[PDB]
Structure 1
Amino acid sequence: DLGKKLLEAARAGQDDEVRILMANGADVNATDNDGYTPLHLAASNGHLEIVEVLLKNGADVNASDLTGITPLHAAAATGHLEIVEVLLKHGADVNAYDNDGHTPLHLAAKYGHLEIVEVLLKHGADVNAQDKFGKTAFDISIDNGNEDLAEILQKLN
């Protein structure tokens, strides 16, 4: 019961409720049937303070959902730069691959998030990572018409 409530409070950005639920014993690593954890939903919905308190209560920074997406994938795809930085600071795996073979760098490129691409690169993103169709972040940029990103990535190896 409490796990499902915690997931919702994290998604919704209800800071007091998140803290009350954890204190009542809600599993910070509870998962729904898509494999979403409170950390996934706080990251995707841009709730940085909630991301931080979840991490302090033992949330698994590298938990994978049913599609293989981790909290860092979620923050990167959704353009949340500050959350990306917090997750990296807590050891999020910069080169985690989802079920399609996409790393956080691939998803940042797909959704056009230049700052996040820069930060992932600085934190050691494998620029040569290939997805299930052999595509790099550079290829994804070209496919999605993100020419400024393509410019940045084209000469990297």
Structure 2
Amino acid sequence: KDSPIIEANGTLDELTSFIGEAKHYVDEEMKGILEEIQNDIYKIMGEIGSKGKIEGISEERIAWLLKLILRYMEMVNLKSFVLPGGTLESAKLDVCRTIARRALRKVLTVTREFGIGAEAAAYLLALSDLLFLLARVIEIELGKKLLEAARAGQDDEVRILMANGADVNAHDDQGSTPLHLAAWIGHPEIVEVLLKHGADVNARDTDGWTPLHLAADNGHLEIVEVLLKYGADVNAQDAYGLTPLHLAADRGHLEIVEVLLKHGADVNAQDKFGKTAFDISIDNGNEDLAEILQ
């Protein structure tokens, strides 16, 4: 009869329907999680419909939700605001999160009007946090599969995932972007297809290696020149102060050296140890490289 109670019940039932539509895009594990969440939401709906006469959820449910919160929190690294909807699954889950927030406001209003349902409000808040975490986890999983595809180097998974909205500039715990892996393995086509959609050529790993430094380290002319036409920093310095030309001279790639020189590389740059690329060439006894470097 009371309008707030009916509105809260309707909003919760909408929330459980949205959970139902979302639960068809996840694996078995999140599917089971969402099913027991449906069970708890139905319990809350039954409790509210009786004005607290029928016993509802128990504190074990909230403890379980907090356990899940911690479990998915250890596996996520939130650093800045992210645009919702990285992939279909994340978008569905975040929509469910917003509906959960609406139902949470409804339950809070009902509690303020009647003094019951505080545990339901806490459960819904935990549900909102859990859905946000699940969306971020799905995004991270897609990024990890993208990294796996880049390491494999055969581009079908790369393109299907990139079209699917997987984060292009996601990084491993080492800090390597898919561009870094593509440069390391030696599959350029992935490098171009990633660079087309705004891939940052100047990404920095935890080891100081940019994609261009490591790519030139492997002696891959094609990938390096593709990076250069895409605005690669010809004189970017690593964690040891090395420019691309220093590492180019380290393995004696004359063609890489001359390409870098054509694009503004500094022959006499200083690293942390003070070594210059020309002096590096002199040290190893290669004379044609020094002649080109001079």
TM-score, structure 1 length as denominator? 0.93
Q: Is 1:63 aligned with 2:172?
A: no
Instruction: Work out the CA distance in 2 between the residues paired with 1:52 and 1:115.
Output: 21
Q: Is 1:96 aligned with 2:223?
A: no
Q: Which has the larger radius of gyration?
A: 2
**After alignment, is 88-97 or 40-49 more displaced?**
40-49
Instruction: Work out the CA distance in 2 between the residues paired with 1:32 and 1:142.
Output: 37
**After alignment, is 69-78 or 114-123 more displaced?**
69-78
SS in 2 for 1:63: coil
The alpha carbon displacement at 1:59 in A equals 1.1
Per the alignment, residue 86 of structure 1 pairs with 226
CA contact (8 A) 1:44 1:74 kept: yes
AA aligned to 1:129 is A
Per the alignment, residue 34 of structure 1 pairs with 174
**After alignment, is 91-100 or 8-17 more displaced?**
8-17
Identity score, percent: 84
SS in 1 for 2:151: helix
Deviations 1:21-75 (A, max 9, x none): 1122211100111110000111121111000000012211110111211111111
Deviations 1:50-104 (A, max 9, x none): 0000001221111011121111111111101011111000000000000111111
Per the alignment, residue 137 of structure 1 pairs with 277
Deviations 1:108-131 (A, max 9, x none): 110111100000000010112111
Instruction: Work out the CA distance in 2 between the residues paired with 1:50 and 1:123.
Output: 23
Per the alignment, residue 143 of structure 2 pairs with 3
Structure 2 vs 1, CA of residues 8 and 144 (structure 1 numbering), >3 Å: closer, same or farther?
farther
AA aligned to 2:150 is A
CA contact (8 A) 1:109 1:146 kept: no
SS in 2 for 1:133: coil
Instruction: Work out the CA distance in 2 between the residues paired with 1:33 and 1:143.
Output: 36
Per the alignment, residue 164 of structure 2 pairs with 24
AA aligned to 1:42 is A
CA contact (8 A) 1:75 1:84 kept: yes
Q: Is 1:127 aligned with 2:267?
A: yes
Name the structure where helix makes up a greater proportion of residues.
2
**After alignment, is 49-58 or 143-152 more displaced?**
143-152
Instruction: Work out the CA distance in 1 between the residues paired with 2:276 and 2:154.
Output: 38
| Equivalent residue pairs, number | 154
**After alignment, is 92-101 or 140-149 more displaced?**
140-149
Per the alignment, residue 147 of structure 1 pairs with 287
The alpha carbon displacement at 1:142 in A equals 2.9
The alpha carbon displacement at 1:150 in A equals 2.6
Q: 5+ unaligned residues in a row in structure 1: which ranges?
A: none
